[PDB]
Amino acid sequence: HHMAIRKILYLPDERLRKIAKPVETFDESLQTLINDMFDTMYDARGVGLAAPQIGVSLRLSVIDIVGDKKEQIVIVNPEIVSSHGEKEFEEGCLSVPGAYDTVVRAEKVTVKALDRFGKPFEITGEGLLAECLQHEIDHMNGKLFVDMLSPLKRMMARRKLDKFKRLQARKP
Amino acid sequence: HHMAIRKILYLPDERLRKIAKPVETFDESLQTLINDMFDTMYDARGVGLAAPQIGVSLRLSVIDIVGDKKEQIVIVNPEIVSSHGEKEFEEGCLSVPGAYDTVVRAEKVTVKALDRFGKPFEITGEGLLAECLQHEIDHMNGKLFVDMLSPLKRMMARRKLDKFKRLQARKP
Numbered sequence A, B: 001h002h003m004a005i006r007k008i009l010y011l012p013d014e015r016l017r018k019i020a021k022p023v024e025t026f027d028e029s030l031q032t033l034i035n036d037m038f039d040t041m042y043d044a045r046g047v048g049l050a051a052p053q054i055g056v057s058l059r060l061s062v063i064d065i066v067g068d069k070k071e072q073i074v075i076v077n078p079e080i081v082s083s084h085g086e087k088e089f090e091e092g093c094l095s096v097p098g099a100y101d102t103v104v105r106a107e108k109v110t111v112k113a114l115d116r117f118g119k120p121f122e123i124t125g126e127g128l129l130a131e132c133l134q135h136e137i138d139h140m141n142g143k144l145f146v147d148m149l150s151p152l153k154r155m156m157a158r159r160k161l162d163k164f165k166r167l168q169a170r171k172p
């Protein structure tokens, strides 16, 4: 069922910039991957995680905004079918540790996808769920939230990330 | 100048519930502690850290909302002298890993404190800075952000924290 908590990749790892490939096989190894992704997400204090963030080039993300099992969402091969409004969100990313910035995203989005067993579903989110859905799909297209920021803010995020990496190297 | 990245304590460690004592001596040992607190905060991807969170019962917090050295704030023996408004904030805490919730705090706060060398100063913050000043001072009074949540939300944060601890035990 579960195998290992996985290493999360940080910028500038090129695997975070690859366009992920659709999932086309629903077998036990996919279920093990999904289970490890949830474990990895919770262990990293996130509310979502996309497969490219652990070096797996698949259009697959796990999400839990509430933080318990009954509200777990898996989006496989998602597509945004509609979106409405614009809203500022204060956001971070497990692949850009330490960087927090305000970004503008749709206030409401509807996503069609396959669930973790390959069965079609749709979900409409607002607030954090809408933000998370857009953030995770961006990862599947090699896009990270710092990309939409000004050059100044991208530079500051780079400096913060570089300092984080230097501190991790001094951690016991 | 720097000694070691420190272990951050999680609920229910009783040291997070103690009332911190005022700082009385501004010596080199205090500077080393402050430097280590900044390192620990950045390494944990936080924008503030209070000394009780590393098991040091002192009314001392480090803050960096922006993420660079020019905006570092140190508050020593702080006192909120005024505040205005009430605003919802989405918040987490380094001492409650994995828990994110909306809390109500003042929108604007004015704090009198000593800086890292013991010089009195006053700071007025809005937005994130106001939220952070209030969050950090709460830590000095043995208060964590989950305390203001409903019993249902406190239970959900406890179980999320317990799951995080179980995953940490299974991390390589």
Ligand SMILES: CCCCC[C@H](CC(=O)NO)C(=O)N[C@H](C(=O)N1CCC[C@H]1CO)C(C)C
Residues within 6 Å of the ligand: A045, A046, A047, A048, A049, A050, A053, A090, A091, A092, A093, A094, A095, A128, A131, A132, A135, A136, A139, B090, B100
């Ligand atoms: C919020 C929805 C979009 C962000 C999703 C990310 C996780 C991620 O990188 N997926 O790619 C996350 O959990 N980020 C966290 C985050 O930004 N959070 C956590 C919940 C609320 C919000 C706080 O700004 C940080 C703290 C790691």
Ligand SMILES: CCCCC[C@H](CC(=O)NO)C(=O)N[C@H](C(=O)N1CCC[C@H]1CO)C(C)C
Residues within 6 Å of the ligand: A090, A100, B045, B046, B047, B048, B049, B050, B053, B090, B091, B092, B093, B094, B095, B128, B131, B132, B135, B136, B139
């Ligand atoms: C936000 C001001 C009050 C929170 C301060 C805490 C740090 C802390 O626990 N100090 O005691 C923090 O950085 N929390 C982070 C947090 O809530 N952040 C980071 C910046 C913005 C906001 C996102 O919700 C989480 C992600 C660890």
Ligand SMILES: [Zn+2]
Residues within 6 Å of the ligand: A092, A093, A094, A095, A135, A139
């Ligand atoms: Zn991300």
Ligand SMILES: [Zn+2]
Residues within 6 Å of the ligand: B092, B093, B094, B095, B135, B139
């Ligand atoms: Zn805290």
